[PDB]
């Protein structure tokens, strides 16, 4: 029954987000330094983000317990081909949104009906606010509710590849980002970033207050710029790798502009139609909370 | 010593299974949390209820 000192569960060594590359294991901060980019002249301008709709879906009665956490990641950064998922037990979340409920949310990423014996879980009070915002992710494919899978991506590219000199004006030149690679590359970061404990992050966003939110956003603006990069190569138009003499570069076509089908096919992670609606519903919901 | 007295320790899981579902039948407010500060005054007064 862990608690947060307002440092948050992210101020802990229990679960930390680390990519493995370079023959040893490294933190996200060290990785991003390799991403160097130029310009190709198609101005990607920051639009406004429309507020979400308050209505929460109903968690249709369900016996047993689903791994609510699993699906959140298994859709966003899921590597292995994921079939249609617009359907599913994806809104049991809202059953935590009400005041007095007994249903608890454990560590590891499960949603128990009744707290059982020997299972460590997040604090029942700070998991409430996380739900009154993310249980709203249940209606991701209901017509007349789904977000728009175009404009948010403009917001995304201004984040992982936008030098501050640009974001302070709200406009930037479309970039083509290439870092140096190894073998599997793009697919390897996916099989890696999947098992990260995303819930250990999102809970902090909706609780931690201005004192420990300005400090929280400063140490974690990088764990965000990591699960935002992989989520981006699932959109880019090309992945062709340039060649030096012995070196290899993974030029990525157009980060921040959204096409409709993956450049990866075989080389990188791939999305599906049912997932395009999903990524837009996540990316929209999370940005208001972050920004 | 005496192999007795001192303080009585029990694991949280043993508490919830036997004690928590049984004191719950009666209309008594759930056991008070031990204070980070000192409350050697009301420790038994809130335990009295």
- Biggest sheet layout of chain A: 2 strands, antiparallel
What percent of residues of chain B adopt helix (DSSP H or I)?
Answer: 10-25%
* Biggest chain contact: A-B, 4 and 4 residues
Q: What gross morphology of chain A would you assign?
A: globular
Measure the end-to-end span of chain A. 30 Å
Rg of chain B:
13 Å
- Estimate nothing, just give the exact number of structural domains of chain A: 1
In total, how many beta strands of chain B? 0
Give the class of chain B from helix and strand content and strand pairing. Answer: mainly alpha
What's the helix-strand series of chain B? HH
Q: How are the strands of the biggest sheet of chain A laid out side by side?
A: 1-2
Terminal-residue CA separation of chain B: 31 Å
Strand content of chain B: under 5%
Contiguous helical run count of chain B: 2
Tell me about the largest β-sheet of chain B: none
Order of helices and strands of chain A: EEHEHEEHHHEHHHHHEEH
Protein name (chain B): VP1
Protein name (chain A): Viral structural protein 5
Organism (chain A): Bombyx mori cytoplasmic polyhedrosis virus (BmCPV)
PDB class: virus
Brief characterization of the structure:
Chain A is an alpha+beta fold and 291 residues long.
How does this model look, in words?
This is part of a larger assembly, with chains A (about 290 residues) and B (about 50 residues). Chain A is α+β, with helices and mostly antiparallel strands. Chain A has one domain (about 1-290). Chain A has helices at about 30, 70-75, 125-135, 150-160, 165, 185-195, 200-205, 210-215, 215-220, 230-235, 275-290; strands at about 20, 25, 35-45, 105, 110, 170-180, 240-245, 250. With about 50 residues, chain B is mainly α. Chain B has two helices and no strands. The radius of gyration of chain B is 13 Å and the shape is extended. Chain B starts with 11 loop residues before the first helix and ends with a helix. Chain A: This is Viral structural protein 5.
């Amino acid at each position: 029954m862990l608690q947060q000192p307002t440092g948050g569960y992210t101020t802990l060594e229990q679960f930390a987000f680390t990519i493995r590359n370079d023959g040893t294991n490294a933190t996200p901060t060290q990785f991003l330094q390799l991403l160097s980019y130029e310009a190709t002249e198609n101005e990607l301008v920051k639009k406004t983000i429309p507020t979400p709709e308050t209505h929460l879906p109903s968690a249709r009665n369900v016996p047993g317990n689903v791994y609510i956490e699993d699906a959140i990641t298994q859709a966003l950064f899921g590597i292995s081909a994921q079939n249609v998922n617009a359907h599913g037990y994806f809104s049991r979340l809202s059953a935590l949104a009400l005041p007095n409920t007994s249903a608890r949310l454990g560590l590891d990423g499960v949603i128990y009906n009744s707290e059982t014996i020997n299972i460590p879980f997040y604090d029942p009070a700070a998991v409430a606010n996380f739900a009154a915002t993310y249980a709203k992710l249940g209606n991701a494919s209901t017509p007349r509710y789904r977000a728009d899978m175009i404009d948010i991506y403009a917001h995304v590219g201004l984040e992982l590849a936008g030098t501050d000199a640009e974001r302070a004006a709200g406009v930037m030149p479309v970039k083509r980002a290439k870092f140096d690679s190894w073998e599997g590359s793009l697919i390897s970061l996916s099989r890696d970033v999947v098992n990260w404990k995303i819930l250990a992050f999102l809970i902090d966003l909706c609780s931690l207050e201005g004192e420990a939110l300005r400090a929280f956003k400063t140490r974690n603006r990088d764990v965000f710029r990591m699960m935002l990069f992989i989520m981006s190569t699932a959109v880019a138009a090309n992945v062709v790798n340039r060649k030096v003499t012995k070196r290899v570069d993974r030029v990525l076509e157009y980060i921040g502009v959204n096409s409709m089908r993956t450049a990866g096919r075989t080389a990188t992670i791939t999305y599906d139609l049912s997932r395009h609606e999903f990524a837009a519903k996540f990316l929209q919901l999370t940005f208001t909370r972050w920004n | 010593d005496d192999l007795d007295e001192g303080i009585r320790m029990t694991t949280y899981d043993q508490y919830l299974s036997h004690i928590r579902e049984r004191l719950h039948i009666t209309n008594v407010p759930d056991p008070i949390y031990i204070t980070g500060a000192s409350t050697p005054d009301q420790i038994a007064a809130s335990v009295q209820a």
